[model samples]
Target: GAFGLVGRINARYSELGGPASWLGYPTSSELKTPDGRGRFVTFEHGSIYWTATTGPWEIPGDMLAAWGTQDYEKGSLGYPTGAAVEYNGGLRQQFEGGYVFRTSNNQSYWVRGEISKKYAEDGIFAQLGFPTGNEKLINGGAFQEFEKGNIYWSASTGAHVILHGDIFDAWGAKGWEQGEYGFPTSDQTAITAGGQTIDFQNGTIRQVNGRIEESR
Candidate 1:
């Protein structure tokens, strides 16, 4: 069984070099070797190198190398001190490719890899099946709102509900907090003035009777 989203991470690698440059440091005057091999080198910046025998090493090129200020207003990964809505007693969820699961103690966590097709579809309706239980399908008109969050529904399954509690935070305690607008569900649909057409199997919104509509 699982609770949230899961996916995979792919990364690449590269290498750069310059003579004794590969060593990143100046050869000691006393150190003797072939002309190019014993040549001295000094780097004004840090450098990374790998050797079949020595593995990898980092050489300091400068005392004050790359230093700069981060502007949070511009969206830098800096400390954020402000108010925000919080959730309690809920699960934190993470995803990579397809698999999903909740953390221990009901917190949020992440897993990587492909997910089973059924479970992937189920996540859209309910994180880990329905909060109620999987034996029975949730009925139409059934609605739930998280204590401090907004409601979400899966149009595809006609299951619109909220997970009770504060927002799920996988990183810290005091877990849920307060601030800002509510967290809207990824499935909630907008309504027009009149009635609207809702596709329960696909969770799509269409015009009906001059109004936007969604399946119950």
Candidate 2:
């Protein structure tokens, strides 16, 4: 149409309601991606990208900016599966290779592979809140910080979340997953009134009332 769109791009444009849609009109003509494997058309509010294998997927608003930081299809996330969906207080967009999450502050972070699987185990957004940072490489593993906790993953230990509290502090003092306790095997569980416990590979840490304790 106005952006000289044709073929796949045109079909998707019309499907999304053209100028009257959330994306509005095309701001840029269909352009070749730097990786040379896909083509995309930018809209006033977002963009629609197409690839022979992945087809077309629309990413709108701040989610688009989040995708850009990760290098679009060329980065770890690959191409989007569809448009961003509302979740909790932010947005969640799934990609072929990973996931992008946009926080209320407009900042974004990604979660992928095994950690993504773990995050989904307990309704991610509600359990961990929004991610505070991207996956960061640590001693022999990686970790992604969330508003309520942190998810740590290692080839030897898998993925586990450590919520903010005394147990988290004790773990840090003892050298985190790198110390004698090792990775956590279970999430925090209540054992009694005002008491909770978390089991690691080699030990257990607990908090009762306001007191903390650890056992091997």
Candidate 3:
């Protein structure tokens, strides 16, 4: 109920070292979550958050500072949902608003909010699987590259998935985001005769062997 979590925290396990550090001041006291389901305590360098099923885990360095910018555990991002884990080729942390995924070489980004919801539609471990890199800033907005193709997003456009194979090759040749067709607005759909349909915001690109014509 009090600073029970903090008083028992060991700074040795954190990247921020121990409370012995000069910045070992308590920035936030034992604070309960807005959802009223969890509690956390903040220190000058880092903090420890806890849950019933999950014990205390350290939120250290820039990661904590990054979370701070979004308003901490009480913000739209909510509390730390899970421990930081080694993912596909990097690190990953889950939160209420979305997930913060770090790539193999230390590159990381947020895949949360509405966009996060879409990434989870087919499950994070789909054919595209976990993201191979961070969400990159593009001409109009941003897009995350995956094992397949990409998932494009913009303020007005929202999110749409683009996959690999002949269809994607055709889309890429047309210059992709900065080209005539722009970003895709839908996932690839299946059709008979081994054909597939890819929907764009303005039109559809159908593939069946260089069939570069608009239909839907």
Candidate 4:
């Protein structure tokens, strides 16, 4: 979906007392665009603000609506700020029990362990990968292991870390994927003492400690 359309719908709902109120969604009156391609809408009573887009419906209306409402209910409005900013990067690497990945920005994020199949339960930890780019390294590249945590790097100097807690955090993202393989694919051809393997293609962790890995 195009990013602009999603913004518009969000602005519209914010006017109707959506979660934007507490998160500081903007108001229609606060719009500054001369043509109105990008503007803000706020609910008069709830203090919610919505940033609208002036573009076509790139994102499906249903999808956008669902996300807007869900985020509102979750109180995850507005761009993450301050300490919250620390959590905006990406991750790479997957663990068998649970794994973690560092972002290009040097922040660490992880998932908890997955449930066992014998218990008729879901795997606790699922896929984990970092974003690309300096601002957010989503699936950027392979990460290096450290004493306290692990580090991921891009073509240049974009490096991030994954601490012990991050491994547990990955488990909490929705558990493990079905038909999963261990970290580091057969293509990596190299394994480290810390149980990390590299995929030269995207520089992501092909395998980490015998767990298949994936990123968002």
Candidate 5:
């Protein structure tokens, strides 16, 4: 009874039904995390992490794998702060640095930093759908793909969404974030000229003369 499990970790383990819980058996002893701000114990099916600021929270195998992609506690997510929650038939968990979301099929993705800010304002789940992948570096800026489209961000122009199609293709043709138009400043919208239009830091793109064109 007094093996590696003790203190707050033990209490949580026993409260969760120990070996019978979904977490399964403890596979590792409690260990201090890399940052030295938190500690955790790995279990057969999941792991429990603890810290002074963020209480103990269990991260299942899938989420742990996803967190590992971010370099665990040392990465952008930092540490798990809340338990996995169900929303719109999917799973989402909050972390100190960002958020991790799991689709109904079990694919996981994380959102953090400047892009995350825009994501929240742009409306999550409802607007962008689940993040299709993690943020990626592009030129001097970054972009994250969503089920509906992509959100591009740069220091000068902030963050903006470009739904897949004409404006996105026109921006890409000009050089994307590295191009003359720079990062997108607004989402693609309807214009009196027909088709759609999108604003950029240095120019605007729309359907003109039956072709996608950009103007500064």
Candidate 6:
């Protein structure tokens, strides 16, 4: 007998298309979580997480694993604010906590918590563009690559920024590590003398101290 939440879910399933759809079937019925904020229905192809604010949405494939690590709805990212979306020619999923971006190759990463807040606050929203991937774990900390630059963080250093361009290119050309400057130690900034600059483990790159500029 279809009734209550189960009946409503079945109706939703049929409206969306049943097994013939990406949802597959209702394997677990509608189960409420401890938070009492929402309910979920396990489907063969994917599972749906629901809440009043986020409504009901599907979490599929690797996306599920990525979100589960943070304790789902209870994590810093509250609930998924939206379904997976195409972004930067790749794909991205938005959460109340942050954002999870997946690469075309299937690699995935997330931005959330303090970093997520910093990202938007620091102009990464439109100034940098969508993250190329999640914060990469390396050395004793982590760093995330963006369309225009990168942000690196650690327990001791917090977070620093770098933008890819002539300056970054120069750093790369110098072998990045094998040559001179290793990983950047500071966010790119303007100097009192008049040029953009950043510091590295071994050296530094200063765009120009009132020197000739390249338009392109």
Cα lDDT of model 2 by residue, 1-216, tens digit: 466787788789889888999988898888998889988999888889898888887787677776677677887779887667886777888888778888887788778777877886756556678888777877877888999898888887788778898899998999988899988887766676988788898999999888999898
lDDT tens per residue, model 4, 58-82: 1212222322432421222221111
lDDT of 3: 0.65
Cα-based RMSD of candidate 4: 15.6
Full ranking by lDDT: 2, 5, 6, 3, 4, 1
Model 6, residue 86: displacement in angstroms? 1.6
Cα-based lDDT at residue 146, candidate 6: 73
Which lDDT value does model 2 have at 48? 91
Task: Report the number of clashing residue pairs per model.
Answer: 22, 0, 0, 56, 0, 1
Q: What is the C-alpha RMSD of each candidate to the true structure, in Å?
A: 20.0, 2.1, 6.9, 15.6, 3.0, 6.5
The ten-residue window of minimal lDDT in model 2 covers 119-128
The TM-score ranking, best first, is: 2, 5, 6, 3, 4, 1
Clashing pairs in 3: none
What C-alpha lDDT do the candidate models reach, one value each?
Answer: 0.26, 0.82, 0.65, 0.31, 0.82, 0.68
Global local distance difference test of model 6:
0.68
Which sections of candidate 2 miss by over 4 Å? Answer: none
Output the worst ten-in-a-row residue range by lDDT, candidate 3.
1-10
Tell me the tens digit of each residue's lDDT in model 6 across 18-111: 6788766556768987799888877776777777667776766577777776677777777777777776565777888887766565666678
Q: Is 1 or 4 the stronger prediction by TM-score?
A: 4
TM-score per candidate: 0.18, 0.89, 0.58, 0.23, 0.85, 0.61
